[PDB]
Amino acid sequence: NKINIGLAVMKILESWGADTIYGIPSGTLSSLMDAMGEEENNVKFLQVKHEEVGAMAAVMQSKFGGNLGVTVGSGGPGASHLINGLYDAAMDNIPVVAILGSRPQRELNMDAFQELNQNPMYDHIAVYNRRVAYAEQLPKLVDEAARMAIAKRGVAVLEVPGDFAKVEIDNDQWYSSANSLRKYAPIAPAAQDIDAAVELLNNSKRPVIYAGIGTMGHGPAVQELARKIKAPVITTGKNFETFEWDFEALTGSTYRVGWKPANETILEADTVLFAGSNFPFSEVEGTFRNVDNFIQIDIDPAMLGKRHHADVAILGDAALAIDEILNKVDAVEESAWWTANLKNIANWREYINMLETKEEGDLQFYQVYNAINNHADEDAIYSIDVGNSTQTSIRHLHMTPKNMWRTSPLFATMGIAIPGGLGAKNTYPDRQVWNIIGDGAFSMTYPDVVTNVRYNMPVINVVFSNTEYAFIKNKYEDTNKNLFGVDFTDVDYAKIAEAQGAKGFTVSRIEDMDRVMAEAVAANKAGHTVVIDCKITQDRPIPVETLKLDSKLYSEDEIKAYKERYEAANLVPFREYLEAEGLESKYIK
Amino acid sequence: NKINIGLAVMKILESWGADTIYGIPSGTLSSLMDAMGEEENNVKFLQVKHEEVGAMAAVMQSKFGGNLGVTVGSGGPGASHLINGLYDAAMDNIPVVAILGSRPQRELNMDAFQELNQNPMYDHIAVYNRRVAYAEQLPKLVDEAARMAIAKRGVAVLEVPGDFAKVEIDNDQWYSSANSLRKYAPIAPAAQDIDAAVELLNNSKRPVIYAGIGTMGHGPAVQELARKIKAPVITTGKNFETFEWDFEALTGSTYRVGWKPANETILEADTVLFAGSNFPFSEVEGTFRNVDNFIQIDIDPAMLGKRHHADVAILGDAALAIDEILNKVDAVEESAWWTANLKNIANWREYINMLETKEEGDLQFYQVYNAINNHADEDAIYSIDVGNSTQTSIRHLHMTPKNMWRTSPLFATMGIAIPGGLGAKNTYPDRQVWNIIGDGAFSMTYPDVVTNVRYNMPVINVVFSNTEYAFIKNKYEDTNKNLFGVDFTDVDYAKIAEAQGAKGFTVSRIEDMDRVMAEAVAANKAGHTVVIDCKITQDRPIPVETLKLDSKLYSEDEIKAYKERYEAANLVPFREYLEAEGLESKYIK
Amino acid sequence: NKINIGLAVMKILESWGADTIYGIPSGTLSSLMDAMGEEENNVKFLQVKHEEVGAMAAVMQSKFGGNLGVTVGSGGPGASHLINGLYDAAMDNIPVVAILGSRPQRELNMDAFQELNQNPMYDHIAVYNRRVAYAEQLPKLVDEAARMAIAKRGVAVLEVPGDFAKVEIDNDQWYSSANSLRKYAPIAPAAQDIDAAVELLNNSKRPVIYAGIGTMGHGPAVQELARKIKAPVITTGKNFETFEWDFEALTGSTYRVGWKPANETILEADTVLFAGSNFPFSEVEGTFRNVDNFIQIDIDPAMLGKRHHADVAILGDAALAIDEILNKVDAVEESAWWTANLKNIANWREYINMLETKEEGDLQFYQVYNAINNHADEDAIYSIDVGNSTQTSIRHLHMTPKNMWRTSPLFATMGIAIPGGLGAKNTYPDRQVWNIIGDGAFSMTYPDVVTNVRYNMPVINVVFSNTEYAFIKNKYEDTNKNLFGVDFTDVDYAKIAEAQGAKGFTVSRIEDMDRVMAEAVAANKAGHTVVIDCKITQDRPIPVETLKLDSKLYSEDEIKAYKERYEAANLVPFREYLEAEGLESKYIK
Ligand SMILES: Cc1cc2nc3c(=O)[nH]c(=O)nc-3n(C[C@H](O)[C@H](O)[C@H](O)COP(=O)(O)OP(=O)(O)OC[C@H]3O[C@@H](n4cnc5c(N)ncnc54)[C@H](O)[C@@H]3O)c2cc1C
Ligand SMILES: Cc1cc2nc3c(=O)[nH]c(=O)nc-3n(C[C@H](O)[C@H](O)[C@H](O)COP(=O)(O)OP(=O)(O)OC[C@H]3O[C@@H](n4cnc5c(N)ncnc54)[C@H](O)[C@@H]3O)c2cc1C
Ligand SMILES: Cc1cc2nc3c(=O)[nH]c(=O)nc-3n(C[C@H](O)[C@H](O)[C@H](O)COP(=O)(O)OP(=O)(O)OC[C@H]3O[C@@H](n4cnc5c(N)ncnc54)[C@H](O)[C@@H]3O)c2cc1C
Ligand SMILES: Cc1ncc(C[n+]2csc(CCOP(=O)(O)OP(=O)(O)O)c2C)c(N)n1
Ligand SMILES: Cc1ncc(C[n+]2csc(CCOP(=O)(O)OP(=O)(O)O)c2C)c(N)n1
Ligand SMILES: Cc1ncc(C[n+]2csc(CCOP(=O)(O)OP(=O)(O)O)c2C)c(N)n1
Ligand SMILES: [Mg+2]
Ligand SMILES: [Mg+2]
Ligand SMILES: [Mg+2]
């Protein structure tokens, strides 16, 4: 009883649940692909236009809760095109199997055509990186690659000479260890550490909960704890979906891609409950410079006390920890700290709502997000690209745990949106998927819009056309001293979409946004991939990391100019709200 | 309130329990070392003669249950000398902090004297590998390096420009996260998996327990389980101390560095309980080629089903798993399989004992080990080097859990013995420490014998002088086809020892061994480091991976020659014992 | 017609002149070594005690003008032990072939015993780094490795699975490209650039010639040019042998390992003729801070204008360039600049000679060098280790082009002396070879003294025993602010030497030095390797990089203390000599 090595490989991938391979077919990968669909195998190939899109899609697939992704790249240039997707997965600790094709074994080291040592290529970021030495061990290595990708939460790479998959072996000369896959259940926290945390929280006059994705799946519990001890909630740029968008005590996120409330709260807080987070701006932006006590909860020992000295360290699942704390902590009836924060939050929501609900004028991204909120399904999935217009989505999207919002948050590679949409739609074929993209990022990946069309994976692409980079337009004055230089004409994305078999729309006026969005959604429900080219203004989101509103921190002229520029006449500095409740700023003046 | 960065670094190391730095002082490391012993700091420097010895000692320190080790290497050649120690730690998953000195910041990239990019040097094996960008962050990075070394169980590397440690900072500009150190407690296994294991064990006619270091600390329980279900025990080359050397059912280890019983048992077994092991020879030597069922217990998901398909996979602490299995499994009163094995083991012990107890003649390593057994403390520590004479120690040393036996088991670097002795003696100053070394390995490290002398860390070095490499003398016929070529004259190690301030002994006769060993131990108890130059024969340990004893596997001539060569006339093939109990070989004929 | 791959490999090495392989025999290298000496092959194996010594010897062999060296390291720890030797070769641009042994092909990627990916190990420093993919291509790759090592002037690395060399192939399936070896002849400089150089030299009032090893073989011409235009000569730490030690206008080298004259001259010069040098201290020590014009000659375009802006750049052989300049430049009859320099040099020689010729007292390295000068052959070879006592040899050894002086000048790895002696003696069996070593460096390599003994390669080891590191004792005050901490007892090296089959001597008094040196040389001429343990004082060489002698640069107290400490009462600051000739310092005051 013999079996083709390529088929054995497909059977192994199938056993691990990796039923989708992303890439472009070619010579150095043909032997493997030729076995797909054989003997009832269910592994399918999803062909992309650029390998980086395939790599990112394989990765985003897991981020969205899908199966283990597999991405391939032909010897040399195909393999190197995977880099942005693999680095993203490495930094986000996302499991993914990358198979690098290669010239046949006989050609290795001969300086043959497109023949090179690809082992160095991804050695720095991989959790597994090997060049298959002979055909007969390919199955064992693919099996281990999957096992390692999952166990080590990262990129497992295999360089495979193109002649190996054609070889035949005895069926008893291969096996899958997928049946032995086991994962650790939630780890219960140490009572000693939970008690120390409870004591600090009980004695704090200004507690604040800072929740990262470690709290995913436990938003209701966090909101319950927040209300019990009257502690406002701050979230991370990756964790907005965990909370009800309209939660009374949600202050948003800190720093640039955040809200005004969160940025003011963290500088006035006394005790922080850092739950399931590895906020990267912590040290360099002095996020916790005014905090007195720091309590951290995490399942990874490497993270304990990393972003700030921890007065209390809790090793364990955030869910279990939050529950234990919720049960032991004292209830707080009233709090000036809480009252002041709720008003500060309400003030901010009045501002955001007024921008979103404008009725006429030149289109701004604010109204595009408004239209999305008015037409999106309650369980819609959002694949967000990297840029100023897209990341500001967290100030507008009315999400809940029913949604999923993913991007490239740390490596922050542009072009992640479209790949994300493919991974999502592949995992949830009957679910509404949105790709929110800036024109710069769209320009790096729009050729792959045809991929959604060809594979009947309908998505809604929302493109923000604002000529010059909005975000980049904010780093030649706040850091530099000269002008700018980031111009771009204006290509017709809607026309390009039509040329690709997709449905294109173009909108540039607030009064036309709702209708255009309605037609776009209806078109998507008819099974079409759509591209909405939103010609927006040059307006930038109000800089919440530099709030020029407090008269004790900035001059009248500054405040006046700041308000006029961002239409923020009605925003009120947090200190006013603190003082209105009988409290005083702990750092201002 | 200011503080020297070097001192802050020492305070951090002290907080993590890393109170010993191994290396050689010099310019590119002086700024750091100059702060040692300041403001009551207790971090001490242990100066070696070769940096590789310092690196290996820092690593072996942890292997022996000591504190986190720190090793330093001066810019360029000092740092590169650490390689063998770091690779060993990487492959053994042992935490260790390596600090690479470097030319001052101003000289970087200038192609100055001894100035180079050292980031590539250890990037492949490190769990952390960074070049400090500016003086003020050195404390934070040393703190994280320790946190990462421990959490990731590996090598954390920092390249430190020599001018950084001289800089001063505010005391509030640094902190240690050592107080937040937390580790996961033993993980309880899934009842479902324990039950599946119990069912297989209950229905097995020939069960065998294969225990690796995952069972460290639970030998009594394993021995109890072995007796309850009448399953012989096989151990790994790293796990002998876990069992009482004279346990009735201990068959030893498989393959070359093993015993005859274990090698025959594994080929006749039906069900294997692979507990806490990652035996590297599994696949390439077909260790489990005749097994029917395979049950594996491990705390690392990456290992489940790695060395063989697992019919049952148990994720969890070996201790807890063994206890649960012991409690649920059915007791077995009698077993022909067990009886046959006990006799096979007894036959082997008769052979080994007869070699160890010879009374007169040219010295063989067998009698050296006999002398060690007759004079060593019950809690003696053994630091074993890499070679034929030293590794065969597991066939002779009468150990128990009261002992510790460590070597370089996977990377297998020669020269690990002396460094191991330093790490051990540093951790246990009042405990008997033995370094068992071959002359080849001794020749790579004997200059450091002076280190034990100078720091008053008395150890007993036992050197096997056999001219040509015993092990290497067995790879020019069993693999090659030509002669050999591994000669060495015979230097006077005892004389060298005296020249270094140590006490030297020379012995070449069996009838002189006991007295020499007695004087050596007495000398060590007087506070002296000793070197026993054992001039042994060219005799090689009987090859248990190729037992030429069964008349159905080898010819009369072969058996006759095999017996005469290894004085094994009385060894009896396991099949005879199986048949004597009414059983039949499952593979022979 | 078939041939063993191992033999084909040896035939190829032989054709490239690589007739000596350094290393230690073992399993993963046996297949290759088993073919040595077959079918009249003349490649021999030189067995060392530590692989780093083998690597360094293979490299030093070429530095001393020998054949292409080959060094081997067994899979894992053997290969990693080569690092210090390979990094040295990489930084010095010395050709060398390194063969890394490896577990058999079938074991690769199986996580077998001592099995690992060694491709990352030396990728950063190698000019060629490949893992042989299959047995049949081994010959082609060894051939290319030699071709690349030589053409790229660096380290060519091949990882070779241990089972490949055993395979047989058709004799017509391999060939050597050694017959096609071709090298570029000296490149003639552009007349345009030579003329620009001549013009500057002609118009300079204070010309100085700074000669690096690019001038090797052309010292007489440089000395002739120096005299013709009356330009003093400065040499590099690697180029002393190029000049007659007593040349009237030789000022020595600049910075720490240099002479007083050179250090003062460079700061007073106007035009520098930088010939064949890449002096690493140039920028970081501001060597040329006071120069007005800079003319550089080099055969490597990458070096032109590297160490300083070049007013004139000459691409070409230093010999040809010097000759063209010598022929076109104007002769200079007299020069105050020249006269002042000759007197400054003479003053320095009076100082050095008085220290070297002391008659009685505690031994200092000065008198050891004196004894060497009085007994060494005119064509003696000097292998110098890294340290304060050894590098200061350039202030004392009376060398000429008949000698060869080599060390590890840039990577600066300690332990280079003994390996250098092996490479030298292997290349010149009937030539006197000296290894000058500090006790610290000796302690990292003395086990290999037995290698010279066993292979009958008689060398004279001169060891400076000064307890604490002399050089290191000068970096805890001139850079740090605390005490020191670099103590070492005092082992009996002479006794160790005797134990190794060598002849040991011990000397600690000036009045005994000549006799001891005489007996040592006579013993070496009797075919014995000798070890002279020179117990010297703690005295440090006078710091020429910080001359506290000029009353306009330092205080009376400083000058007085400086003179008393270094017995330099009679040294006169260069400015006095300049002013005596009617000139003025261009920077002092
Ligand atoms: C252009 C751009 C701008 C951005 N701007 C901002 C900004 O202004 N503000 C902002 O906040 N973000 C911003 N981000 C996102 C930011 O870079 C980070 O990716 C994000 O804040 C990290 O969020 P996190 O801490 O929730 O999760 P991660 O960094 O993913 O860390 C999660 C932590 O939770 C732990 N964990 C996981 N599971 C559990 C469990 N069950 N129990 C306990 N612990 C668990 C993990 O071990 C880990 O330590 C931006 C991103 C981009 C691309
Ligand atoms: C020259 C030389 C020759 C050798 N020859 C032999 C030989 O012939 N035979 C031989 O057997 N060895 C030999 N060895 C040793 C061999 O190379 C391996 O290092 C050794 O067998 C590995 O043993 P192990 O499986 O116990 O542990 P490891 O390889 O260290 O693996 C231990 C396993 O236990 C798991 N674990 C850890 N803690 C727990 C826990 N609490 N609960 C559950 N699981 C846990 C780990 O995750 C891991 O999978 C030799 C070594 C040398 C240097
Ligand atoms: C501990 C220690 C201390 C030291 N201290 C000092 C010190 O104080 N002072 C000092 O001077 N040195 C010192 N050195 C040596 C120093 O580090 C350098 O290695 C040495 O100065 C480099 O000398 P170089 O310029 O002659 O040659 P290299 O750096 O080898 O460069 C030679 C140049 O010549 C060129 N070249 C080669 N062939 C030709 C040709 N035919 N024609 C033209 N150009 C050619 C090359 O391309 C190259 O640019 C020390 C070394 C050590 C280990
Ligand atoms: C692949 C990649 N290249 C470059 C960058 C740098 N970068 C970050 S934001 C940005 C501007 C992107 O502009 P666009 O997508 O048009 O978004 P906008 O800021 O205008 O909304 C750039 C170039 C990046 N993050 N990723
Ligand atoms: C650093 C290092 N170099 C080389 C090897 C290869 N090797 C393995 S065993 C061996 C022989 C060692 O001989 P010795 O220490 O004399 O022990 P013996 O086998 O004679 O008892 C060698 C060279 C190794 N394991 N480590
Ligand atoms: C392999 C290596 N390790 C460390 C250094 C750092 N280093 C440079 S000089 C020196 C002192 C060496 O002392 P020794 O050989 O005794 O010579 P001395 O200075 O006393 O004459 C050291 C440790 C180096 N150059 N190479
Ligand atoms: Mg844009
Ligand atoms: Mg030996
Ligand atoms: Mg010294």
Side-chain angles (χ1 to χ4, degrees), chain C residues 278-293:
Chain C
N278 191 36
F279 187 56
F281 296 99
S282 301
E283 300 98 333
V284 301
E285 298 303 327
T287 307
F288 309 112
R289 59 174 176 283
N290 297 329
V291 178
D292 306 313
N293 288 160

Side-chain angles (χ1 to χ4, degrees), chain A residues 212-213 236-238 254 257 276-279 298-299 303 317-318 408-409:
Chain A
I213 63 168
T236 62
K238 287 174 61 175
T254 72
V257 175
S277 174
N278 191 36
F279 187 56
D298 207 288
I299 54 171
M303 302 290 94
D317 181 72
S408 173

Side-chain angles (χ1 to χ4, degrees), chain A residues 389 438-440 464-470:
Chain A
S389 304
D439 49 8
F464 292 115
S465 288
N466 62 2
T467 299
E468 298 187 4
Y469 317 117

Side-chain angles (χ1 to χ4, degrees), chain A residues 119 123-124 129-130 140 143-144 147-148 151-152 175-177 179-184 187 193 283 298-317, chain B residues 119 123-124 129-130 140 143-144 147-148 151-152 175-177 179-184 187 193 283 298-317:
Chain A
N119 191 254
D123 194 61
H124 181 66
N129 179 48
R130 307 184 174 179
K140 183 193 189 303
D143 176 70
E144 184 153 81
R147 169 153 38 76
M148 291 293 171
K152 303 303 186 181
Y175 73 89
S176 165
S177 57
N179 69 301
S180 300
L181 171 59
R182 298 285 184 285
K183 294 180 173 304
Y184 278 123
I187 306 297
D193 295 322
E283 300 98 333
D298 207 288
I299 54 171
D300 182 358
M303 302 290 94
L304 299 178
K306 172 173 173 59
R307 299 297 178 175
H308 190 282
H309 168 77
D311 297 285
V312 175
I314 300 168
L315 179 63
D317 181 72
Chain B
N119 191 254
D123 194 61
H124 181 66
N129 179 48
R130 307 184 174 179
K140 183 193 189 303
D143 176 70
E144 184 153 81
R147 169 153 38 76
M148 291 293 171
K152 303 303 186 181
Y175 73 89
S176 165
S177 57
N179 69 301
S180 300
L181 171 59
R182 298 285 184 285
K183 294 180 173 304
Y184 278 123
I187 306 297
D193 295 322
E283 300 98 333
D298 207 288
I299 54 171
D300 182 358
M303 302 290 94
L304 299 178
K306 172 173 173 59
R307 299 297 178 175
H308 190 282
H309 168 77
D311 297 285
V312 175
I314 300 168
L315 179 63
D317 181 72

Side-chain angles (χ1 to χ4, degrees), chain B residues 312-334:
Chain B
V312 175
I314 300 168
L315 179 63
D317 181 72
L320 299 176
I322 292 298
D323 291 327
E324 293 292 323
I325 295 177
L326 179 62
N327 180 68
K328 289 182 174 178
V329 76
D330 288 349
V332 177
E333 304 186 67
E334 80 80 59

Side-chain angles (χ1 to χ4, degrees), chain A residues 139-264:
Chain A
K140 183 193 189 303
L141 300 187
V142 167
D143 176 70
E144 184 153 81
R147 169 153 38 76
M148 291 293 171
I150 297 172
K152 303 303 186 181
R153 291 193 174 187
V155 182
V157 190
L158 293 179
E159 180 179 11
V160 188
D163 59 312
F164 289 176
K166 296 189 299 180
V167 177
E168 173 179 290
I169 59 171
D170 293 351
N171 190 67
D172 76 312
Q173 293 296 171
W174 74 272
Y175 73 89
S176 165
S177 57
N179 69 301
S180 300
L181 171 59
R182 298 285 184 285
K183 294 180 173 304
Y184 278 123
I187 306 297
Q192 182 191 185
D193 295 322
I194 293 294
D195 289 348
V198 166
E199 190 174 68
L200 286 182
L201 290 171
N202 277 167
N203 302 154
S204 178
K205 292 189 176 184
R206 301 186 180 187
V208 63
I209 296 167
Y210 208 126
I213 63 168
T215 58
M216 277 265 185
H218 313 103
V222 176
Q223 299 189 187
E224 184 175 354
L225 174 61
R227 290 181 177 173
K228 183 170 184 179
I229 66 175
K230 298 301 185 300
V233 173
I234 294 178
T235 181
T236 62
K238 287 174 61 175
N239 200 46
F240 274 85
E241 73 197 56
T242 296
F243 303 102
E244 292 287 326
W245 69 275
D246 56 352
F247 175 53
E248 56 176 351
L250 173 61
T251 64
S253 50
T254 72
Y255 197 47
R256 294 183 176 174
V257 175
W259 302 9
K260 166 178 178 296
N263 278 104
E264 295 173 304

Side-chain angles (χ1 to χ4, degrees), chain B residues 50-71:
Chain B
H50 192 294
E51 297 94 334
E52 80 173 316
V53 167
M56 288 187 269
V59 178
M60 290 297 272
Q61 183 175 93
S62 286
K63 297 193 191 185
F64 283 121
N67 303 308
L68 172 66
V70 178
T71 177

